[PDB]
Structure formats: C-alpha cells, structure tokens
Amino acid sequence: GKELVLALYDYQEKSPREVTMKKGDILTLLNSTNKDWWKVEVADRQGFVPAAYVKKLD
Q: Cα-atom radius of gyration of the chain, to the nearest Å?
C-alpha cells in the first residue's frame, strides 16, 4: 500500500500483529483487503488496526 489514512482515534495494540496509533496520525495503508483489520505503517512500525478507526485521505 502507498496511500495514506488518518487515525480517527487512539488505538493501543492488543496482540502481536497489531500496532499502536494516536488520533491525528497519518499512516500508510499497507493492506485493506480485510473488512475489519487494515495493515498500516505508523512512523516506522507496521501492524493491524481496526479499519473503522482510520479514514482514507483519498
């Protein structure tokens, strides 16, 4: 993924495959094939966060 999304809420990772984000963060959308969990890159960290908690910038 190369597109960006905006974190709508803070989100602390709850499992090994998740990643933490803060509201306002601009993340790189890595994979949105799953309806519920999108893989994103926050700073230099990658992982899944709830899809509904981020908003595509496009």
A: 10
